[PDB]
Paper text:
Here, we present biochemical and structural evidence that POA inhibits Mtb PanD in a competitive fashion and that it binds with a high degree of complementarity to the active site of the enzyme. PanD is a proenzyme and in the structure, we observed the processed active enzyme after cleavage between Gly24 and Ser25, and modification of Ser25 to a pyruvoyl group (Pyr25). The active protein consists of a β chain (Met1-Gly24) and an α chain (Pyr25 to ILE115). Our results show that resistance to PZA in PanD mutants primarily comes from alterations in two loops covering the active site that have subtle, but significant effects on the affinity and residence time of POA on the enzyme rather than from directly affecting POA binding interactions.
Numbering used by the authors:
A (entry chain A), D (entry chain A), F (entry chain A), H (entry chain A): 1 to 24
B (entry chain B), C (entry chain B), E (entry chain B), G (entry chain B): 25 to 126
The structure:
């Protein structure tokens, strides 16, 4: 039987940019 | 998606392409995407494409990845928890998702 | 996230860090997070961070975890169903998700 | 082949606290 | 959650407790829950608890379950597709999710 | 490598009841 | 759901029935469904049923599938990234989710 | 231990039709 477990957390990170046309 | 500083990906044990949940402290948005490697040391947390409808520049976000594993392994599993500063630099790495530094 | 009384985690076969879906009877919110161990016997059901946009103190919530398993195992699998009282103390543990006590 | 099955349920629990700044 | 006529669960290869996605043709709601066995032959499609915020009596809904499997198996896998009539009785069972009878 | 594949579909089913206080 | 040109499914390594996330550049909608094989070479990207509440004709969308795999495999895994033109014809196939042609 | 990884992407595709009554 398989459980789903938290493995990574980066917390209270500040978004540096957010735009509809940027791809990555 | 989300473009993450390579230093942060390494600190958090995230691979390029790994599924990632984003939750937004400021507006409560919750979405699922994948990690894209960002320029190492830049502090980039970039939201690209469709997700920019829900997440805005300057927002505080939490980035989460999950693993699937055998019950026996899950009982001893230790997550990789990365606390960052105001410039998205890793200042603490531990096992406790609820730990806050200083 | 969600901070759960250790007694409730044990009763429900939830591990620290295990993924958990929360649904809110009062407002209909549905979200996915992970369990954080709360002080044993306190009755804490604590909503932390981003999820506090969707879930409020005094709300009635259902906490759900899923397992992935082989088809053969799934046909005989028995869930751990924990019914709690007004103080979040476990009063009944069984196999039937639809069972209500008294 | 793998199925996804309910394994844990805690139901009609009362939220004792809910705040944006609490971490856990 | 969702209470499903046992006849429909059998027709669709759904086990009690199996995760189920519900999508609502009338209002576009999409949610994830699990199946509860309903009285065989009654035609019950019952929405219980929190999900009743999003799904209402008389709505037309689609019920979906997914499996995880090896790549080799997925290339030959055949789903169980159950078309029902106005009384939630199974009138056609096949492999094609887009097939409509008559 | 594992893929996630559709395995069950019941479609255009009519909801017979929907209420906040019913448990199952 | 979503009906996809068979040419696009092949280019992207999508099987009939494979789970697919759709995100909408125009309105920010995000949903999970499965792929249905569309007429080869037609350029069809068809949204059927409930999902038509969230996605509209002429919208720009991204289609995403995920795989679950061993940690060792995930470190060397290469996704199948398909860039399409204004007529939904595949013009570039590579490993980089952030690559844009010309 | 299993990770969930992106495996397929078709991007900036144009929706050709979208209707409530079409099945597939
Ligand atoms: N993108
Ligand atoms: N937190
Ligand atoms: N319930
Ligand atoms: N459909």
């Amino acid at each position: 039987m398989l459980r789903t477990m938290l493995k990574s957390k980066i917390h209270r990170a500040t978004v540096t940019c957010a735009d509809l046309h940027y791809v990555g | 998606x989300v473009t993450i500083d390579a230093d942060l990906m390494d600190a958090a044990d995230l691979l390029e392409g790994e599924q990632v949940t984003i939750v937004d402290i400021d507006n409560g948005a919750r979405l699922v995407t994948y990690a894209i490697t960002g320029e190492r040391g830049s502090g980039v947390i970039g939201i690209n494409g469709a997700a920019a409808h829900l997440v805005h520049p300057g927002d505080l976000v939490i980035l989460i990845a999950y693993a699937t594993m055998d019950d026996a392994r899950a009982r001893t599993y230790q997550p990789r928890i990365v606390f960052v500063d105001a410039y998205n630099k890793p200042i603490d790495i531990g096992h406790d998702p609820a730990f806050v530094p200083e």
